[PDB]
């Protein structure tokens, strides 16, 4: 089993077609689109459809990791490297050596991080902080972001060489507001989680479905999942309509 999402609209059809376009090769995969559009499941299903199937999948949400700590968890460090290191642990490449690396939120990469990732991509090797050992590992890297890159390089704070190295295989993500027609079916996907995680149940009425479809949905799929689980948890086993939707979700 795995985390599953389904759809029928034209945007998600293009999504699967474009995924299958690049699924036949192994290189850096750069994903562009707004945040909360479902990039993690894209990376995991690309891996599940890639050569690596017994290898583990390592996700790294750079928005949930401090900027100074990103290289510490990614590359790894020995026991004695700085004032905060008290134990030698391997970097996240070693834990998933022979798997699939996912690196979300590439927007806030510092220049040392950018050059280090470029070195990792080019020479296929790295080195732990406070050490000189050169270790090489093999992995398939999928980087993701929430800001459009072109402007981000135009600001001059993104290295163009790393931009071109990652953008060899660009990925376009379609926000849900252009594919609202399958949302109901997508809703029937999320209730599967309630039937797969055993945390309650929730239903959606037709009026509720159309009211939800009108909503702008900035952080489309993550906000959809958060809203459905929150509605289920606040009062399970109840009927969901238009009025009891928290706010702005009753756009009718």
């Amino acid at each position: 089993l795995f985390r599953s999402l389904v759809g029928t609209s034209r945007a998600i059809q293009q999504v699967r077609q474009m995924m299958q376009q690049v699924a036949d090769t192994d290189a850096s995969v750069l994903i562009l689109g707004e945040s909360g559009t479902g990039k993690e499941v894209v990376a995991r299903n690309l891996h599940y459809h890639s050569k690596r199937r017994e290898g583990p999948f390592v996700p790294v949400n750079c928005g949930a990791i401090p900027a100074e700590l990103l290289e510490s968890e990614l590359f790894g460090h020995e026991k004695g490297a700085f004032t905060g290191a008290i134990t030698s642990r391997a970097g996240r490449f070693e834990l998933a050596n022979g798997g699939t690396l996912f690196l979300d939120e590439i927007g806030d990469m510092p220049l040392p991080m950018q050059v280090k990732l470029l070195r990792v991509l080019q020479e296929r090797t790295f080195e732990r902080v406070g050490s000189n050992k050169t270790q090489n590992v093999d992995v398939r890297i999928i980087a993701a972001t929430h800001k459009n890159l072109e402007k981000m390089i135009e600001d001059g704070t993104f290295r163009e060489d790393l931009y071109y190295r990652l953008n060899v295989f660009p990925i376009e993500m379609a926000p849900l507001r252009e594919r609202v027609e399958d949302i109901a079916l997508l809703l029937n996907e999320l209730i599967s989680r309630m039937e797969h995680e055993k945390r309650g149940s929730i239903r959606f009425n037709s009026a509720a479905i159309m009211s939800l479809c009108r909503h702008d949905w900035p952080g489309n799929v993550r906000e959809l999942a958060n809203l459905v689980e929150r509605l289920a948890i606040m009062h399970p086993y109840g009927v969901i309509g238009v009025g009891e939707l928290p706010k702005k979700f009753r756009h009718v």
């Binding site: 583990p56 390592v58 996700p59 790294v60 949400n61 949930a64 990791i65 401090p66 100074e68 700590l69 510490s72 968890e73 700085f82 004032t83 905060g84 290191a85 008290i86 134990t87 642990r89 391997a90 996240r92 834990l95 998933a96 797969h196 995680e197 055993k198 958060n226 809203l227 689980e229 929150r230 289920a232 948890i233 606040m234 928290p246």
Partner: protein
């Protein structure tokens, strides 16, 4: 078996955070497994005082590098390897996030925790508390029927949602004089959250106000062992199953969290 780590929070002081953490850990220990309690109040260690144990070497030694982590695992009641921290040390309170992360990574050495590790977070919404709750898989909120406790719990929820987007929370009621009191408190807190933000919170249980807890604390021993046949002890025992066995089909994801080495594979 990927290790699930529970952290006890609530912001409001004196709710019972250290006490509920110690008693719940003893409850899981008596109900199987082998818990390894940790107190996140790195400058105010009250787990040892409540348990009556004398820590020869504390977590301040491994913070300063004097000894390894396995050195400070101190056996206590119920077969629990308490990891006491320093008491009365400000230098051990406010650490840089790098040191906190180094501590989280140093926990990876121990591999004798049967999916159990209780964290006793300090009072407040400071950097240490948030850094530890991001590292935990279950965050347990202990709150009492008092509007200041509601305000502090809601403030912690708001901070976590706004900065880090935490979504799932566990609500536990303490110092509730009636079974209806805890549910009313949970209803008020979720009403505030529903009015303002979008966070789902889960019910856990209730700890009634019993003088047995006071008498046991006076005896320098935890209430679970001093008065095992008591309403508070029975409440902790009931909370044991709810804490231990709910996430049976656990799917280990990956971010800055405890035992990430075991979660990856």
């Amino acid at each position: 078996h990927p290790v699930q780590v529970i952290a006890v929070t609530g912001g409001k002081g004196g709710v019972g955070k250290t006490n509920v953490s110690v008693n719940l850990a003893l409850a899981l220990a008596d109900l199987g497994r082998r818990v390894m309690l940790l107190d996140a109040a790195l400058g105010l260690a009250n787990v040892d005082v409540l348990l009556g144990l004398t820590p020869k070497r504390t977590l301040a030694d491994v913070i300063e590098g004097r000894c390894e982590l396995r050195d400070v695992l101190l056996l206590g009641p119920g077969g629990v390897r308490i990891v006491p921290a320093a008491s009365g040390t400000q230098s051990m309170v406010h650490l840089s996030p790098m040191q906190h992360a180094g501590l989280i990574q140093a926990f990876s050495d121990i591999s004798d925790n049967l999916d159990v590790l209780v964290v006793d977070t300090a009072a407040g919404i400071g950097d240490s508390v948030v850094s530890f709750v991001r590292a935990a898989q279950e965050v347990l909120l202990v709150v009492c029927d008092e509007p200041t406790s509601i305000t502090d719990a809601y403030a912690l929820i708001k901070l976590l949602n706004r900065d880090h987007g935490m979504t799932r929370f566990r609500v536990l009621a303490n110092m509730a004089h009636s079974p209806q009191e805890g549910r009313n408190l949970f209803a008020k807190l979720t009403k505030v959250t529903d009015r303002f933000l979008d966070v789902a919170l889960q019910y856990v249980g209730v700890i009634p106000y019993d003088e047995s807890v006071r008498k046991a604390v006076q005896k320098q021993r935890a209430v679970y062992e001093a008065f095992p046949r008591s309403k508070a002890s029975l409440a902790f025992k009931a909370v044991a199953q709810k804490v231990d066995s709910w996430p049976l089909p656990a799917n280990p994801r990956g971010h800055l969290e405890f035992f990430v080495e075991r979660l990856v594979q």
